[PDB]
Amino acid sequence: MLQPKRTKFRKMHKGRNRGLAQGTDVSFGSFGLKAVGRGRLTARQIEAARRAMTRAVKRQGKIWIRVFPDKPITEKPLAVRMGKGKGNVEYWVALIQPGKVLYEMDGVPEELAREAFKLAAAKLPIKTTFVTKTVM
Template structure:
C-alpha cells in the first residue's frame, strides 16, 4: 500500500478541505480517467482496491497511472469509545 517513506511527524493536523481542485483535474495520460464527484479524503486501501479492480477488468490491455498519493494520515476513534479523553 502507498504511504510516505519518511515523515517528520507521525500524525498531521486535520485541517479543512476547501473547494474543488484546480490543478490535476484534467487527464494527463491515456484516454480514460476516474474522477471524484465529491470533496473528501481517500485512503491508500481505497486506491489499492480501485487499482486491483481496474487491472482485473482490463486484463493487461492497457496501463494504469495513479496520480494521487495518500500522504495525510487519517485516524478515527474505535467503536464504543467516549468522545474526548475523560472518564
C-alpha cells in the same frame, strides 16, 4: 496499501478540504476517471479500485493513480476517555476536491475503459465520472 515511506512528523491536524481541484485533465493516458464530488479517499479504497480495474482490463495497457494517500488519520482506541494526548496513527487518506482526476489509462478501447472504470468506481465513496483527453 501504499503510504509515504517516511515523514518529518507523525501526526497532523485535521484541516479542512475546501476549494477546487488542481489536476483536472488527463495528461498521461487517453481515458480517465475523475471525482465529481467531495470526500477523502483512503489507501485501501485506492488499492481496491486499482485491483478491480487491473483485473477488468487484464493489464492490456497502463494505469496511472493520480492521487496519493499522504494525510495520516488517527483514531483513539476504543473505551478510553478524552484528552491524554492525540490518538495513534490509524491509516492514511488523500484529500479529494471536485474535478480532480483519480485514475488514467490508455491503449484499451473506449468500451473496455468504460466497462472497467464502471466497476472500479464502486470501490470509492466519492462519485466519479468518465472523461477522454482532448486537445488542450
